[PDB]
Amino acid sequence: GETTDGVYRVMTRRLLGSTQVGVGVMQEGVFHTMWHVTKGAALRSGEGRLDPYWGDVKQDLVSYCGPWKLDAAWDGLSEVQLLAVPPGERAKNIQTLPGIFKTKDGDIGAVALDYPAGTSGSPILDKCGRVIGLYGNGVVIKNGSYVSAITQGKRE
Amino acid sequence: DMYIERAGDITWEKDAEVTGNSPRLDVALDESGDFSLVE
Ligand SMILES: Cc1cc(CO)c2cccc(CC(=O)N3CC[C@@H](N)C3)c2n1
């Protein structure tokens, strides 16, 4: 199938019409998404088949065809771009300065941008265009608005 | 059965729409990978 680097929509026909359940990143021949999007199911790329290789429900991450490749980190200071890919709509950069998820195991980047759940898997970039993590695992706050972690995996 | 379609390049776009705030949030992460507000 198509193994050009870039961002891709994750679609299903198991419901009415063709439905976008999420987004993902192709890099170095590996496809990267969020576990809650695919549930670790295989994927089609034309005639090509993509088999899961690594995943973890707690990180809510999954890689296809190879190990996790994305190792760039939010620097803790600079603004970032959410390369959002919403259902039925074209790819759109949105610049923001991330907030902070404070946890017992450490502090994580967070972006306060609200988009349909089908946007889950859209990447977040540094000023050099490197992927520092994926969008779509987070929390609903006092206001009723959505805040997402900058979810990054470990490269071996 | 699920399939992928390409939707763009991964590029920093100068003078993109600038928006969103920057909250500091106390959160817990459970074994199911669901975040929650530690209040
Ligand atoms: C309720 C809601 C609302 C919005 C936006 O208003 C979302 C935006 C992106 C992604 C998700 C999905 C999400 O955060 N999780 C699913 C799996 C679990 N671990 C968290 C969203 N979930």
Nearest in space to A30 (alpha carbons), one of A73, A67, A55:
A67
Q: Which of A27, A113, A139 sits opposite B20 (nearest CB)?
A: A113
Residue A91, in any domain of the structure:
yes
- Resolution in angstroms for this experimental structure? 1.9
- CB of A117 less than 8 A from some CB of B: no
- Same domain flag for A96 and A137: yes
Query: By what technique were these coordinates determined?
Result: X-ray
Compare all CA atoms of chain A with the CA of B33 and give the residue at the minimum distance: A58
Chain B residue numbers with beta carbons less than 8 Å from the beta carbon of A98 are: 22
Note whether residue A98 is domain-resident.
Answer: yes
Counting the structural domains of chain A, the total is: 2
CB of A115 sitting under 6 A from ligand 1: yes
Short-list A69, A83, A57, CA closest to A152: A69
Same domain, A31 and A92: no
Q: Which residues of A are catalytic?
A: 36, 60, 120
- Measured at the CA of B9, the angle between CA B3 and CA B15, to 5 degrees, comes to 135
CA–CA distance, B26 with B20 (Å, rounded to integer): 19
All residues at 6 or more sequence positions from A107 whose CB lies less than 8 Å from its CB, including other chains: A100, A101
Q: Is A122 in the pocket of ligand 1 (CB under 6 A)?
A: no
- Expressed as residue numbers, the domain containing A53 is 6-64
Task: Give the CATH number of the domain where residue A103 resides.
Answer: 2.40.10.10
Q: Which of B1, B35, B38 best tests the A interface by mutation, with the highest count of A CBs <10 A?
A: B35
What is the Cα B25 distance to its own chain's centre? 15
Query: Residue A73: inside a domain, yes or no?
Result: no
Same-domain check for residues A136 and A98: yes
- Whether A74 is in a domain gets the answer no
Residue A28's nearest CA partner among A67, A1, A54, A60 is: A67
Instruction: Name residue A119's amino acid.
Output: T
